[PDB]
A paper describes a structure:
Copper-containing nitrite reductases (CuNiRs) catalyse the one-electron reduction of nitrite to nitric oxide: NO2−+2H++e− ↔ NO+H2O, a step in the microbial ATP-generating respiratory dentrification pathway. Electrons produced during denitrification are donated to the T1Cu site by a partner redox protein and subsequently transferred via a 12.6-Å His–Cys bridge to the T2Cu centre in a proton-gated reaction.
Comparison of the crystallographic structures of the ‘as isolated’ (1.7 Å resolution) and substrate bound (1.75 Å resolution), allowed us to assess the effect of this substitution on the substrate access channel and its associated water network. The substitution did not change the highly ordered hydrogen bonded water network (Asp92–water–water–Ala131–Asn90–Asn107) from the T2Cu site to the protein surface that provides the major route of proton delivery to the active site. A notable feature of the channel was the presence of an additional water molecule hydrogen bonded to the liganded water of the T2Cu ion. This second water molecule has no counterpart in the numerous structures of other two domain CuNiRs, and presents an altered energy landscape for nitrite displacement of the Cu-coordinated water molecule during catalysis. Since the structure shows access to the substrate channel is enhanced, the weaker apparent affinity for nitrite may arise from the presence of the additional water in the second coordination sphere of the T2Cu stabilizing the coordinated water that nitrite needs to displace in order to bind. An additional contributing feature revealed by the structure is the positioning of the gatekeeper Asp92 residue in the ‘closed’ conformation that may result in a slower escape of NO from the active site pocket, resulting in a weaker apparent KM value for nitrite due to competitive binding of NO to T2Cu in the micro-reversibility of NiR function. The sensor loop10 (His94-Asp92-His89) that reports the status of the T2Cu site to the electron-donating T1Cu site remains unaltered. The space generated by the [name] mutation also allows an adjacent surface residue at the mouth of the channel, Met135, to adopt a dual conformation. Because access of both water and nitrite is enhanced, we attribute the 50-fold increase in apparent KM for nitrite not to there being more water to compete with, but rather arising from stabilization of the ligated water owing to its hydrogen bonding to W2, making it more difficult for nitrite to displace.
Author numbering:
A (entry chain F), B (entry chain F), C (entry chain F): 2 to 336
Write the structure that this text describes.
Amino acid sequence: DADKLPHTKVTLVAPPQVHPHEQATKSGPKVVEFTMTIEEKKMVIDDKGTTLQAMTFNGSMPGPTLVVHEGDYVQLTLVNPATNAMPHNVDFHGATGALGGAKLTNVNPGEQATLRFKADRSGTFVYHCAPEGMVPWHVVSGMSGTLMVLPRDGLKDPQGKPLHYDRAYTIGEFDLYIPKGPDGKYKDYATLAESYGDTVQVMRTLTPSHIVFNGKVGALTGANALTAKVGETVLLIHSQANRDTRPHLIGGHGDWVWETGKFANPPQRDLETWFIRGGSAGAALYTFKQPGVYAYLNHNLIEACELGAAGHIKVEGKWNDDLMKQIKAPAPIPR
Amino acid sequence: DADKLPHTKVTLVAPPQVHPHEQATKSGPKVVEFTMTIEEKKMVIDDKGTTLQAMTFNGSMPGPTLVVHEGDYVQLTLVNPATNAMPHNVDFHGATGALGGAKLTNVNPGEQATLRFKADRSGTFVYHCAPEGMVPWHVVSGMSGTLMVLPRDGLKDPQGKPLHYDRAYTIGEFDLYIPKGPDGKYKDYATLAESYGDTVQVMRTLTPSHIVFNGKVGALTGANALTAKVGETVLLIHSQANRDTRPHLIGGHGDWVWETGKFANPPQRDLETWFIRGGSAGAALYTFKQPGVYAYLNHNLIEACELGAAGHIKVEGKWNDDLMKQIKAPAPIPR
Amino acid sequence: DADKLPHTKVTLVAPPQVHPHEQATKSGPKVVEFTMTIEEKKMVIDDKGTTLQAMTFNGSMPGPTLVVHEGDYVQLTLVNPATNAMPHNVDFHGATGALGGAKLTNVNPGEQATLRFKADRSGTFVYHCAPEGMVPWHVVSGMSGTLMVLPRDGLKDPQGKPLHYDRAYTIGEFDLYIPKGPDGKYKDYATLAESYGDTVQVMRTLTPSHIVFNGKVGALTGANALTAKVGETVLLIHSQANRDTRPHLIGGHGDWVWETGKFANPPQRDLETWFIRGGSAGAALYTFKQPGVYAYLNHNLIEACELGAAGHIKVEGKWNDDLMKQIKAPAPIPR
Ligand SMILES: [Cu+2]
Ligand SMILES: [Cu+2]
Ligand SMILES: [Cu+2]
Ligand SMILES: [Cu+2]
Ligand SMILES: [Cu+2]
Ligand SMILES: [Cu+2]
Ligand SMILES: [Zn+2]
Ligand SMILES: [Zn+2]
Ligand SMILES: [Zn+2]
Ligand SMILES: [Zn+2]
Ligand SMILES: [Zn+2]
Ligand SMILES: [Zn+2]
Ligand SMILES: [Zn+2]
Ligand SMILES: [Zn+2]
Ligand SMILES: [Zn+2]
Ligand SMILES: [Zn+2]
Ligand SMILES: [Zn+2]
Ligand SMILES: [Zn+2]
């Protein structure tokens, strides 16, 4: 009975970071309390000034990652401020019943509600908005994120030996469907409501206009590139609430990967490219062995390089000539 | 030698049901005898009166599920009545040789034939029509179903412990390619033959017009919704003979899933969303813990909600507040 | 330290064959030396005279398969002759650092370079060209192949028992994006450079014009069909550097399959259809039990039968009536 347990309150942080948390823990079950506030807003999604009439949990695409341990209870307060135009809700794939919670969290502008569910299954799980009659529209306009339910004794390899990460990043991949006018330029809308009909027509073609990580082309590059060091193990959580994607780390590997994202299954090792099913989140570990700027991307290279699904990881430390060496630099073909 | 064994005759039932059968069995191998009759017919596939010039095994999309045990022999009589216009055949992925049987079962209108093969591999396997030169056309017009070959001692979990289901349902997902005229409305054809050329042109775009479960938008909803009870374990067999799909149960999980559909491999647990490769059938178990109406759908939500790939499961029993509770119903944001 | 070890030199062969090599080996680590030469050339890709302005390693699509053992070092000399127009490089997914080697192998026409890396992970891995700013273009015009890193003691099943193949074939699948003119016919270009802009526009639609095995429609059919005998085990290596595919052997199975292509993971058994993620190579074993001509194909049957992704395997030996028998040949439905 959950009414007996202690409560904790967690303060969420914005992607790509994930809020501090323990992996293996001595602590017993708790009710973990979270709050998120919906923000509808217009966002610029590319380097030519294209806009999206977006919908977000807590102002970001994706929404923040919530982290609990298996056996915990998640207690979410969801707030839809009066500054918004649309009703919203939440479906947690990690939850059991009532369409993931959607049936109990229908909130019109100016309202709020509070849901509890048992996080009884370990893994990374998508959450998303699911208003009746307009589910795909809210999802593809940005209303999704990840719940990570860690096993109480931390992650394990196929032989039951312990695994860990020194640092975690969360990547949400968003297939966008931005309409164009008769002139061939993307339309800019005044309100969310006025984008709907043209957007549905684009959706039905199944061809995204843009595919972005974390809300925009180049979100995870330059000053916003991800960071690590030789010797550090990173966990890359990758969510795609609507469409398949195939994550790859260029110059690296997936050392241990749960592509279906469920920690009670053995992970696979040495992956070049893994597969996130639309409607799921997965997770990969990698320990950096070389310094440099890596790219992390969807390995449909058109989706990555033309449509936007790629970021950078900047890695510090010493080059290792045993792993890789330039034996002869580019030079003329001998006469 | 198969000529020594006893024979049985099975009476098929229409999807979503599956014919009665045992899981683990004391009985030894048999020759299991089936018969199916091809019906070409025009079908209405959506709520605005769109028609498909369809082709079916036994009058349904999908065709009926055939269930045997590993080591059995499947003996199929395939009948193509003179009321049909086209030649047809059958390729069983569960079989070995002669292109799955297609080379031995070429039947013109007014003909019939009988094939035997050993069901020597456990799993769910697609069967489909495969006439030389027009294979994709017969498949996407509806000529596919599932053979389920159960291990002789029933299903097992990764540690070799027994698994079972209390009730089985079969779902065939069909990507349809219905042409449109110059006015933008879908074409209605007088005969099967006259649909061919326009349909090929749509196929080559790789963009379905509709994606449906069991032959039509909403086939598995309302009076035709699937049913279960809290405490009951259901097996969901999902076939897709031509295109990938990503099954999800909203408010539930895949407790044990063979996404590649082959029972001698360990299943994965706790899945939110699984993946059926085009050209395969997979199978998932789930034990219901909450009552309510669930949706089972392809989690490309555009394919589900716009194009038709979704059904309902109505579940009876008692709500469980430990799994999920509404702590505060939707109410105004406190002043 | 790699500078201590003996060197070997391997002579590559053209696909679908793979250069002679041992599976399990008594021999210790070596530096294995390879060389490949880039050839840009116009190729005819279908039976109506459509051309592609192609780019290749060693004149073939795919490039040749390189085979080493885990612990070896791969030493590649990459040559870009002055007869070519574009700069090129190589990214080995099997390697660690410097974007797979791409940063160290930038070679303009008339230049060459030599790279070394440790093949420290077992599996089949894609390699491809990756020039900065035009990565998808070089890949989809044909610049990819497979590195196979065999475990030092050969392949193993899930229980650690030995597996082997008697013969290996390499299949590269290429999604092509050939532009059309206002008349609806495919464009024929005079140079590689002049194809670029129109090709990018087609790429962005995500809809290939053709999908071919080994550079053309029907490459692996007729005189070029693959061959085997009843009793022989074949390994089918399948690479797709940009787009997903779903290999199937019609009339056969995947007996043992590493669909993610990494040999330190247990393989799955009895597959009808497996899944190669874009950006990866996978590998399947099958032991032939029936003679005949088999088709090996991408089981999106539109992609196979309309767009070109299918080949043939011609198999010699004796029919087995226990596996499959025609009980009654096609005959009139009894009066
Ligand atoms: Cu919403
Ligand atoms: Cu969902
Ligand atoms: Cu047919
Ligand atoms: Cu098939
Ligand atoms: Cu190149
Ligand atoms: Cu790559
Ligand atoms: Zn309490
Ligand atoms: Zn560490
Ligand atoms: Zn890129
Ligand atoms: Zn970049
Ligand atoms: Zn008999
Ligand atoms: Zn039961
Ligand atoms: Zn829906
Ligand atoms: Zn519904
Ligand atoms: Zn040396
Ligand atoms: Zn052998
Ligand atoms: Zn074909
Ligand atoms: Zn053929």
